[PDB]
């Protein structure tokens, strides 16, 4: 007996949809859901989605409140829809997927992932919910996450971090590192060996290795000396060049974090969504050095050093493909006289 | 267990709210309520009110579908709120009253009219619903309608016509002529002697007397001759004067109906609401004769003749007060040399 | 002391803005202006313009309520702005001009047309308002209308009809036929010889000549015989050909009116604005004969006969230019063996 | 002579409504009020209320700009409406009350609180405005605030802090501590002995006692030792338990402030309004420990210590009612073997 | 071949409009432009302007991404429109000018500034774009900026700072200090000698002189002693008086910055636009001292000291006009016994 007033009752009393019985008075005006409290309207939800306000309200209330894979991972794995849950995309303030399965009568394409409409779609399954590992085994297409082993299925160890209510974290009181499994056309697919992005923020950036501590503490020339990075263009790629009108390099988040401590800069997120590589229109406030499309990736500095040091530096220009977050990231490598000139996530 | 989905289910299956159990998927977008039918959205309701879309939807679904007094009568009698029903105002496409009693959780000020919040409000009671005659008997303020006699209380015979789903009609299969009772501060009022407006349309106008048949059939001069109306300015007041830039007279609906048969005209309803006297910005299409504020009343021609023939014609200008639909309508009477110059509802 | 509440007071009490003092409570919700009447909101105005709701409300309230030239005439004469009035475009439900002069503080570019900002704009002047003939005399660019003669200036007799509150009519109680004058860069122009469109409706079409009476009364072959129209393709151009999937001809409003009496058809007005030539996507309901772009002109049948009879019929295809409503209308004339095949307004 | 353009003139020139004469051009688009400045539109107000945009604009402009009681206090005292002022609710960005008295023609239920419509409503009166103490004496229901004594009326000393333009502060240049008086059904009511919440922020939290300084400075075990809190579950209730998936305790704002200094966390305010007890969906970013409904109260630590130490610890579970901000706050007390297990504001 | 889908393609791929060929799917809902990415809608733009959403999207995409004069300077110089660029006003989130020249088909009044419609408008020209210095020489009205000298034109050295993508900065990698030129009615105008505002923020305020360092570091009485400011009311004007209900003075941004370090305060920007002098409704959080209209200017402290010390202190009250940002700023000077009482930017 699903209703707008019951979803609102659950939000008000339980903090989210919790299957509880009850109704609260609701008013919908434009794109906002309000509830009456002591004679006045109190805002419960502001629709930022392209779905109808009451529909987006129910999907948000029905969001998964357990640690779930970050939307960039689900996207990189080709996930189309989730089985009997809503993965809320906090970066877009919208459902991560267009349709649902057994969640909301307006967006449901099926009540169970076993329905034939779900066979061509890559359904996300959560091994923490009863019966979902079995539903993945019977699914034609799907991605499964588990906390432990599944007899016969070869696991892929995912990232350490997961998203819990929009907070990306490495769990201590909860498990956030999952085993990942994928099936394409009824066949279990081998997930590739991959690096993982660290999902850190510029404002609250923390080093996760002795190399990262040394990058943030040491001066540019002594860090490059200590880590034998001469001829790898870290001065351009990681530290950044703010001497010309066009900002040079600055493609690693740790380099932006180091700069941010000394002077501020504007990062225009012109495609605001979760992705392995992010594109920003950057304007350095100290110098006025700027770049319309500055691709940034948050790799652990050691992982980036390992990628660039593994490269052959004998050709003028080549596409270097690196698996990051299960996806193929093309990098552009420019060399001269056996030294790196630039190395950046190739702007497609 | 009131809900948006249940109100929508009732509209789709029963044509209105009928207390039936069930839910249909609903989407709200801007001011419209849609329901999904075979994968596509079908419009159920377009909000024309100043209330939230979902709230207006429920009050419209919960509208009274029996013949009810026309909103102009309820307003003239000082009705503030209705007891356990919604009087839908079809002229405004909105509820006739701001609040409800035992109807909708968002608009309810009380569940029963016996609650102390209803004591100072003139509550509308319908003697056709069980226990409402007794709720009026106990009420401090109220208006009661009945189909027959009430013990001890003397009735005021109302108009022949009532509104059934927005259709104003004189019932043949249903009773539309009610007895009216009114209480102010616990005292049963003596409702005054009143004329009633006829609530006719210009396009489907029907005469309701031999004088009205003769007005529409005969020529102007022979009707005035037959009914001894010389000196009463019917040529100006009722027939209308389209010879000058400002349209002269034309204050009786029957006169507009007669004109409408010969040539069309635009009637701008600049305050669209139900009222005893209506104001229109009229433009006669044949002549180009026009008037910004042309007050029109739909009185039976015989009743209008009685009013104008019962006035003293010895003063240049005076206010003539007439009880019409229980309200005091002021008219402006202009005379010269013992004859009428003009007579018009000075009301809005 | 202009205000929203004062404009609303004027609309409610005077039927339009009349400079009266007073205020009524107003509420604005989305694109609608409401006013409170006995505790409930009554709609005063629904904004159909691309201007802000309160601004469009004031321009509509301040609309010219005298017979004014039809917007197609003002446009054809290059009118940019009106002097101290608003020409309301009833076909678009919007002001005919972007800006105003001495009308509304939000849209005013000047308070008087003598301000230098108005010098390059063709200002519309109304000789019926005191001092406007003299403001046109001093203006660099302008269009003047008068009811009589102007000293020294030679007139161009305009169309018989004018628009009074959106009703196009030939005045009997008011004058609708104006003298037109135009100045370009300080020089009084000689307005060209022009035909005028008749501005009739399909539903209320009336013949304005003995030829038009004969077209509507007689059969196709006897009308063409009586008026010696053999070889002029009136069967195709005026009567219409509904025998093939593509509707043939039907470019004169009188021909659509004749057809409309026998059987209905849909006319999709895909560019809804006032213009000399109109384009309709027509679907004949009886036959299913249709045409995406069917250009229709409302010319007096005698004027259309004069145009087609004054053309050289010796070339396969050529452009025929005709001054209609002061503008140059291009027609496409197609001939074969000295007879007309088709003739149609190539205009939009 | 109230108007939209006059309210806007006052906002632009005086920073709020100040009864000044004048008008500025205004445009309303969707839910925003703009004014023209140097040819471009400048936003004056964005409507976040469920009232029409122009109406909410006027109530916001007419907001009380003197220190006023925090909305949680007015609500806890049953205040329905204010006398001749608007208490703006900055937490909701909306008027604290639905209707007004002598403020705005659209929301006014009366011009003076002496009107009979105000008798059943608890009207807020401000003794700092001339004649309001007398109006409270004549009011059937009301709440009065004063800066000093009222002859014969027994005062209740309110909180030290008040809200001045949305800034909660303890006044040094202005008086913020008021005497409070309440009347129910014509009878002056004795306000109960009460504790007061401190109205502090997590980000700018300041200790207001030596115990609060010691809580934030000392380690958990030495604070509990110093203040003899062994057996009172401060480790769970105040410090918080982040070791399991469900976050344990954390019901006192000072405990959240201490945690906030070490590591961040998300507090989802799912019912955003001012209240004595707040409910948050909390997610600890360091551990991933979370709780859907975590009730938080900002009491001075000494006051909380006094409440819990006053409890009988001999029963398994009991409801403990404490008067806070004039309202009865139910707490849930869970004991075992003469020691506290948990003590929290009971989730209703 | 301009289109919505091409503008969106440019935003997604180039970070702004870059004349590139291509189309991406777009959806417009209410005031937001979305693009489809991996089956879900991603927000590209939220319209905060009074222009249609698709039109504002194109003007924002077509914004000037080079360092440009701050909107306060362009306004103070009477700039109406820009030549073949869009100056985006980041403080209003809207175009700085109503119309464009050769930018967008919906807002263009002309394709080239040489068109006669641009002659009466003060067109902004950028000497960094080819042919714009010549277009300024031929323009009747205009403002020109250059990086170097223009043969024969007497330059005005502008402010050190410019706006690059909404970041006000003094360029190190780019030039931000321009030469300014103005023409009124075909005649090159001599720009006056002027002081410049510093365009600093309260939160990230940095001193730009030894006097400014001493103001922020030293105590009030020793700074006034060191700089011989006795009798100049710096205690009131610059430091601020928070002892009474009305906040005294506090008209220099550096004084607000010094206060901000010790205690917070709310600054209500009730007219949010870029201007030489700003007006704020300020509420000091520590004391509750407040002022509805507190005019603030960010002059370099030395420049302010120079202005006030240059004043004659022998009259009770006088208007003192100072040229700041090319505009005449009226100050109010109040003296008594040869000493300053107050000196503030006169509230108009
Ligand atoms: C594209 N981006 C950067 C570089 C390049 N091409 N050649 C050397 C450096
Ligand atoms: C106003 N209205 C109508 C009339 C009048 N004044 N004098 C004669 C008739
Ligand atoms: C285009 N439209 C009409 C016609 C034509 N081409 N050829 C003969 C008649
Ligand atoms: C509800 N909440 C917490 C507890 C309880 N019941 N029993 C002991 C601890
Ligand atoms: C206006 N504002 C401040 C002052 C004044 N007038 N006289 C002395 C001080």
XYZ file of N, CA and C in Angstrom, chain A residues 31 48-51 75 89 92 94-98 242-245 262-266 268-273 279 281-290 292-293 348, chain E residues 10-16 27 29-30 32 34-44 46 60 63 65 67 90 164-174 176 204 206:
252
model
N 8.743 21.889 -7.340
C 9.660 20.766 -7.217
C 10.046 20.439 -5.795
N 15.997 17.726 -7.556
C 17.048 18.168 -8.482
C 17.133 17.237 -9.724
N 16.226 16.241 -9.829
C 16.206 15.236 -10.890
C 15.328 15.691 -12.072
N 15.376 14.942 -13.165
C 14.491 15.165 -14.306
C 13.218 14.240 -14.196
N 13.001 13.597 -13.040
C 11.825 12.758 -12.788
C 10.768 13.641 -12.111
N 29.253 2.511 -13.051
C 29.234 2.996 -14.425
C 30.327 2.333 -15.235
N 22.778 8.820 -6.343
C 23.962 9.488 -6.822
C 23.972 10.844 -6.128
N 25.155 13.949 -8.303
C 24.133 14.502 -9.177
C 22.825 14.813 -8.433
N 20.525 12.679 -7.646
C 19.557 11.967 -8.464
C 19.800 10.486 -8.386
N 18.810 9.655 -8.788
C 19.066 8.208 -8.833
C 20.211 7.923 -9.824
N 21.104 6.974 -9.499
C 22.204 6.638 -10.403
C 21.692 5.961 -11.698
N 20.488 5.352 -11.651
C 19.886 4.603 -12.747
C 18.489 5.119 -13.049
N 18.101 5.065 -14.305
C 16.816 5.560 -14.810
C 15.621 4.821 -14.244
N 52.412 27.374 -13.586
C 51.530 28.538 -13.560
C 52.219 29.777 -14.137
N 53.258 29.603 -14.982
C 54.006 30.744 -15.507
C 53.427 31.337 -16.792
N 52.633 30.576 -17.550
C 52.025 31.085 -18.782
C 50.507 31.242 -18.647
N 49.852 31.911 -19.629
C 48.408 32.110 -19.603
C 47.672 30.779 -19.547
N 48.941 26.555 -0.475
C 49.607 27.838 -0.648
C 48.669 28.924 -1.180
N 47.931 28.642 -2.263
C 47.026 29.634 -2.829
C 45.773 29.009 -3.423
N 44.642 29.728 -3.378
C 43.391 29.150 -3.875
C 43.253 29.184 -5.380
N 42.286 28.444 -5.903
C 41.991 28.423 -7.327
C 40.557 27.950 -7.553
N 39.955 28.336 -8.682
C 38.595 27.918 -8.984
C 38.633 26.695 -9.866
N 36.051 24.695 -12.051
C 34.700 24.608 -12.571
C 34.402 23.187 -13.047
N 33.515 22.514 -12.328
C 33.090 21.164 -12.635
C 31.965 21.252 -13.681
N 32.310 21.436 -14.959
C 31.311 21.652 -16.010
C 30.495 20.385 -16.413
N 30.899 19.180 -15.990
C 30.092 17.959 -16.170
C 30.038 17.348 -14.773
N 29.105 17.784 -13.899
C 29.111 17.303 -12.508
C 28.509 15.911 -12.273
N 29.374 14.946 -12.307
C 29.042 13.548 -12.114
C 30.293 12.842 -11.569
N 37.069 16.433 -15.347
C 37.512 17.561 -16.163
C 37.083 18.858 -15.504
N 37.487 23.307 -15.437
C 37.968 24.539 -16.038
C 38.642 25.199 -14.843
N 39.980 25.212 -14.793
C 40.695 25.755 -13.641
C 41.235 27.173 -13.884
N 41.177 28.031 -12.850
C 41.698 29.385 -12.866
C 42.493 29.540 -11.584
N 43.807 29.690 -11.693
C 44.661 29.868 -10.534
C 44.507 31.308 -10.078
N 44.068 31.531 -8.833
C 43.815 32.896 -8.352
C 45.066 33.744 -8.148
N 46.205 33.126 -7.822
C 47.436 33.879 -7.596
C 48.028 34.451 -8.885
N 48.100 33.628 -9.931
C 48.765 34.009 -11.163
C 47.837 34.391 -12.313
N 46.621 33.862 -12.317
C 45.718 34.068 -13.442
C 45.970 33.053 -14.548
N 46.805 32.035 -14.282
C 47.078 30.934 -15.192
C 45.797 30.078 -15.202
N 45.288 29.716 -16.387
C 44.042 28.963 -16.466
C 44.030 27.909 -17.596
N 40.856 25.575 -19.824
C 39.448 25.188 -20.012
C 39.143 23.769 -19.638
N 39.988 22.837 -20.056
C 39.779 21.423 -19.785
C 41.032 20.867 -19.159
N 39.045 12.997 -24.620
C 38.329 12.307 -25.701
C 37.519 13.254 -26.605
N 29.921 21.920 -27.072
C 31.076 22.742 -26.773
C 31.319 22.817 -25.279
N 30.264 22.963 -24.466
C 30.409 23.030 -23.016
C 30.991 21.720 -22.485
N 30.417 20.583 -22.908
C 30.842 19.269 -22.475
C 32.286 18.968 -22.899
N 32.646 19.248 -24.154
C 33.974 18.909 -24.662
C 35.077 19.941 -24.475
N 34.735 21.232 -24.491
C 35.710 22.318 -24.425
C 35.647 23.180 -23.158
N 34.689 22.912 -22.268
C 34.536 23.689 -21.043
C 33.801 25.011 -21.213
N 33.463 25.367 -22.461
C 32.780 26.602 -22.855
C 32.587 26.587 -24.383
N 18.260 18.119 -22.696
C 16.895 18.261 -22.225
C 16.785 19.492 -21.347
N 14.496 21.413 -18.589
C 13.425 21.248 -17.608
C 13.611 22.271 -16.533
N 12.570 23.116 -16.670
C 12.186 24.344 -16.048
C 13.256 25.328 -16.426
N 16.718 24.511 -16.116
C 17.955 23.773 -16.120
C 18.194 23.094 -17.458
N 20.158 20.007 -19.130
C 20.764 18.733 -18.853
C 21.299 18.122 -20.139
N 22.244 17.192 -19.988
C 22.748 16.387 -21.091
C 22.800 14.935 -20.638
N 22.509 14.023 -21.555
C 22.542 12.607 -21.253
C 23.976 12.058 -21.238
N 24.390 11.421 -20.134
C 25.703 10.787 -20.001
C 25.504 9.398 -19.397
N 25.770 8.339 -20.182
C 25.608 6.955 -19.716
C 24.163 6.697 -19.269
N 23.217 7.142 -20.090
C 21.803 6.945 -19.816
C 21.165 7.848 -18.782
N 21.941 8.677 -18.043
C 21.344 9.569 -17.038
C 21.593 11.045 -17.343
N 20.692 11.914 -16.882
C 20.817 13.342 -17.126
C 21.795 13.977 -16.164
N 22.693 14.791 -16.684
C 23.710 15.504 -15.926
C 23.461 16.977 -16.166
N 23.372 17.746 -15.091
C 23.123 19.176 -15.172
C 24.326 19.949 -15.742
N 24.091 20.722 -16.808
C 25.108 21.575 -17.396
C 24.959 23.018 -16.943
N 22.190 25.942 -14.666
C 20.982 26.355 -13.985
C 20.807 27.836 -14.227
N 26.121 32.288 -21.399
C 27.078 31.837 -20.399
C 28.199 31.031 -21.087
N 30.644 33.311 -22.780
C 31.263 34.281 -21.898
C 32.727 34.465 -22.226
N 36.361 34.458 -21.509
C 37.222 33.712 -20.600
C 38.647 34.303 -20.494
N 40.936 37.713 -18.889
C 40.725 38.698 -17.811
C 39.989 39.906 -18.376
N 29.442 37.376 -12.630
C 29.468 36.262 -11.700
C 28.803 36.585 -10.362
N 38.929 37.149 -14.054
C 39.169 36.035 -14.969
C 38.265 34.866 -14.539
N 37.176 34.625 -15.279
C 36.219 33.562 -14.950
C 35.615 33.722 -13.557
N 35.359 34.960 -13.169
C 34.794 35.272 -11.872
C 35.797 35.382 -10.751
N 37.089 35.191 -11.035
C 38.109 35.312 -10.007
C 38.764 36.671 -10.188
N 38.610 37.568 -9.216
C 39.243 38.870 -9.288
C 40.685 38.670 -8.864
N 41.613 39.050 -9.736
C 43.022 38.846 -9.464
C 43.909 39.889 -10.141
N 45.130 40.021 -9.625
C 46.161 40.850 -10.186
C 47.052 39.854 -10.898
N 47.016 39.898 -12.222
C 47.704 38.958 -13.085
C 49.209 38.903 -12.994
N 49.743 37.673 -13.000
C 51.185 37.405 -13.032
C 51.492 36.644 -14.322
N 50.645 35.683 -14.688
C 50.797 34.938 -15.937
C 50.027 35.607 -17.106
N 49.112 36.545 -16.801
C 48.282 37.297 -17.741
C 48.276 38.763 -17.324
N 46.308 42.044 -16.408
C 45.004 42.449 -15.877
C 44.871 43.980 -15.779
N 39.182 36.161 2.904
C 40.557 35.995 2.445
C 41.260 37.331 2.289
N 43.858 40.276 2.501
C 45.304 40.452 2.620
C 45.693 41.926 2.573
